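Let's do one together. I've listed all components of the complex below, 842 residues spread over eleven lines.
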Amino acid sequence: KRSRKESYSIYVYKVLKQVHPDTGISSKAMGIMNSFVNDIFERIAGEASRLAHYNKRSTITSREIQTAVRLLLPGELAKHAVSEGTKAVTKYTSA
Amino acid sequence: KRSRKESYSIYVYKVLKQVHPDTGISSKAMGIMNSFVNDIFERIAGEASRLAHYNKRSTITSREIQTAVRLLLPGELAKHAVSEGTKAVTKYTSA
Amino acid sequence: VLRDNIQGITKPAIRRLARRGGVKRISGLIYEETRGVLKVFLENVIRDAVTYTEHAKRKTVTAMDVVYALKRQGRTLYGFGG
Amino acid sequence: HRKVLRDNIQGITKPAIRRLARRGGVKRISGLIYEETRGVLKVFLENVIRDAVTYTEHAKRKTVTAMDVVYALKRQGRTLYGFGG
Amino acid sequence: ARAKAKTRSSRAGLQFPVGRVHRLLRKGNYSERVGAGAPVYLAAVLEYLTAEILELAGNAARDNKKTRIIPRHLQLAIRNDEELNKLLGRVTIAQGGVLPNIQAVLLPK
Amino acid sequence: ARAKAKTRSSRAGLQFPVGRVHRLLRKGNYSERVGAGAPVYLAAVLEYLTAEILELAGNAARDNKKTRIIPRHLQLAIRNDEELNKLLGRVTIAQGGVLPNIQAVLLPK
Amino acid sequence: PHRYRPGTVALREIRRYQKSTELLIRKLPFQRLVREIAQDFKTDLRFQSSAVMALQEACEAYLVGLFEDTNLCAIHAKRVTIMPKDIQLARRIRGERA
Amino acid sequence: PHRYRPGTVALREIRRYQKSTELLIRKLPFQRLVREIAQDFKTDLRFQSSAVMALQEACEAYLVGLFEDTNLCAIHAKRVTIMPKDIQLARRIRGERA
Amino acid sequence: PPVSELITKAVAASKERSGVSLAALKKALAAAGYDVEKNNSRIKLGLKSLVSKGTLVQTKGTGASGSFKLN
DNA sequence: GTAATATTGGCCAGCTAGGATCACAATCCCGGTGCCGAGGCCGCTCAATTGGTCGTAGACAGCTCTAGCACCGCTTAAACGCACGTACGGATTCCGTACGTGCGTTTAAGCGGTGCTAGAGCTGTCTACGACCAATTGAGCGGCCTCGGCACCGGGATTGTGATCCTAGCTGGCCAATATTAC
DNA sequence: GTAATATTGGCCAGCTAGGATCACAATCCCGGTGCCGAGGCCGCTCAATTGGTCGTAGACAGCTCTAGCACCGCTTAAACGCACGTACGGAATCCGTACGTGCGTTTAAGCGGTGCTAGAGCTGTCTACGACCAATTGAGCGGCCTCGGCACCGGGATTGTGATCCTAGCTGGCCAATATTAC
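Okay, and this is what the predicted structure of the assembly comes out as:
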């Protein structure tokens, strides 16, 4: 009939072909990557939501995401993630 | 001017006079009890909400509370907390 | 009914776990201690899993229930669909 | 207005570490513990103050309030009751 | 035409506020909808924890001949109870101090 | 009268789904309202983490002469990176195993 | 007559079981044990195979990390052998009741 | 001539500082130090007094728990003295990078 | 110099109610300039045999462990 | 066969321990004091309550078929028990010195106080932004096919380990030389 | 003093450490092979998109005033430095045996194959319940007041520690009682 499981697999495959065109991915590892993305997602989204209420703000915006990212990732990871994310949001705003 | 903060103090004082009529509570301790209650509340409410979505349930009910209580509190504490809570909900339903 | 299968976690299995942990020499009392430790861990994890199950008015414990039990314990397990 | 408050880590003096340690039950302490503990303390503080200043910046405030510190600790899973948590 | 006011907490035979907890579950954005028995059960649970804590803390203070409980008494109550010290084990109490705990080997012979 | 379809992810120059993440922030009932730049920024962040991980894992697999990454490679990538091992430090990886780590004193002389 | 001196084959098998990923606990005893634990909380409970495999996967990771910390405790003692006192210490410091 | 043998007054001050609750870090050095740390992340930052007091209360609880675990590590060695190796071990086992 | 002749001269260096310690013999023979590093087992046999002769005596410990006296 | 010498057990004396005594510091305790925080009271307000409506989440029943369970039989790797031995843990001893403890000296915290003001906090305005909706549609899911990656097998190669032997060196003993003893 | 003997030095034999070599087995590497899972294709669907509306969240300016900051000047209390010394850590040694290693035997894990049912998951119905609104009201908040618990202290009382003195138990030497050797 109609049963729906949610994953990020194809997006992970896209990223992988962007970084390592000559490399494959085991279905086991794609279930791990799917779980990893969902976990990181859940942490960041929980911190951003939790932060907004803690700040008496009712909305999640680029600021709340920026501070949750800056919060959760340590050092050099945060600096680069923040950098590319700002670049991307700028491009999206321009579009 | 009128500024309102939130606390449980009077309720804590009521409980205290129910259990220890001849005992006082310092405002330092009433600020810790207030923080106490809010932290336990945040854990239980977060687990109950989190559990309902993880069960594809859109509502927090006595069931959701019962399993979060049973889940957080360890052993003899949970058994008694569950017991009095069931007693209280029954009384409320009867009323 | 099942009884006394905690001995099922046999001596060589403990030996191999330790070895995967970098252990070289092992005193003979480690085996009972580790069986007890392991018994403790499982009874917490299984308590949480059966609880999540009961809550769903369900009578089978899914892998997702196990994942959430560990995830609550702060020992999130990837790979099982979590 | 804005003092340059450098070299201050040594302000956590030997006897202060003695009395904290003593509150922890230790009886005899080797003279090298002091530098190790100062390093530990700078690390702990770095992490906490980073998280706190972050929670602050988000609010657009330029003052770090106690609510920010308790949220930072609570975020590091070291929740502290008594300061408005 | 209007019935005499009867607080939900009095309808449940409690001291904790049912309306405030109800508000906090809805205004916490925990769930878009909240059942009716959830706030009652939750207030009762918070009631039990505070009563347990306050019983133990009052015991500690009277044991220390203090007629009024203070944070040290809370730290004593918590750390001297096993299941509470388990629930609040990762918790640091303001002005709590530590249990008197000298490891035996440290005492002189 | 209708413009040619342009996916938000293509409007951002990404591969991760902006619509799906948008859906998840709104459906997960994190907040009643969600800004427009939040899902974009979030998808980019998830993109960066997955690309970092996959770069490291592919390096590990090629180092192991493996043309395809498998969970052991993920465990190697994670545990061999300091900041990742910090982010996922409390994490247990399926079929990951452990880093080869023999403490020096254990080697014979 | 040939006999490897004690400790050599042990290091070989260390290198081996660290290079490897196979589950180390025998599957059927661990499943039966899981059933023994669950039986105490409720009777007539059914387990998906993936769920039991998850418990096994998790137990192996937990004990391996525990043995990492334990071996560190033992080596700190300047004792190559691990003994139960090492386990109670490693656990007490992990913060779990012990 | 009177001189308490080493270890006795130490035990008395242990009983004392465990009976007591006063903050043990001197307030002004700790506040100046906090400002030192914050200055690195951003300049011209202002601290409410309650916030600095919170950092101090938390630091004292963290170091006290660390010394609890460290003393346990030292006693396990059968060494009454604590040394830095004990600290790196206690921290590595707490899971914090060390 | 061959061993068993410097050990006598070393134990002759002291009178102690429970004998000269092994640590003293190590330090004294090092002070004589001898390779106590590499010849340690030769030293242990020389000492144990020479106390076994009764020319020296072992008075606490056992073997090279503990303490020693002259005849 | 008998006696003197020597041997063995006991006593007196000496040495070392354990118990009792003393003197001082720390803790506590009993009682007085004031002081301030806990606790109570007051008229205010918004949040709690009540009641009625809508719709929709979810309880419930019924059907499907996945998958969990049970059971059998075989083969075999893993487990077990035992023999054996080395390396380890642990007990003992000893030593040097890093700690601790107790002085005087120095510092800066702490307190109280004053003065200044950045910035927290609140209010009002308003609009950009996000929710909602219907109509549109194409990316994403499931099913199917396939072919290349790789696990396995076997032979050859390499590495690591333990066991063994050889040689140079040193120590111990014999014969000769020198130092000592005798002529 | 000189020569012979007995002690010591030189030569030879025996023992050990280091170096070298061999034996052998675990690991690696390499080909081939066949399996099967990754990856692509197709078709179908519903979630993403677009554009428009509408409400309001929050950006922004402006004002109040709290609270943070800065400086000053005494007052101790704490930090500091140093002298002295002892308990500790740590090195070294040794012994006993607990665990590793290896072998032969036993067991049951694993596979796989079959059969069966209960329970997993879905759909459809229908309805109790909760959101919501409007009107009502009293519990809770802040402000004032107030007074008893408690911190502090001053002065005794009790306890703990460190050091010393005496009585005692144990061990050693000589004497008493007894076997061994010489006459």
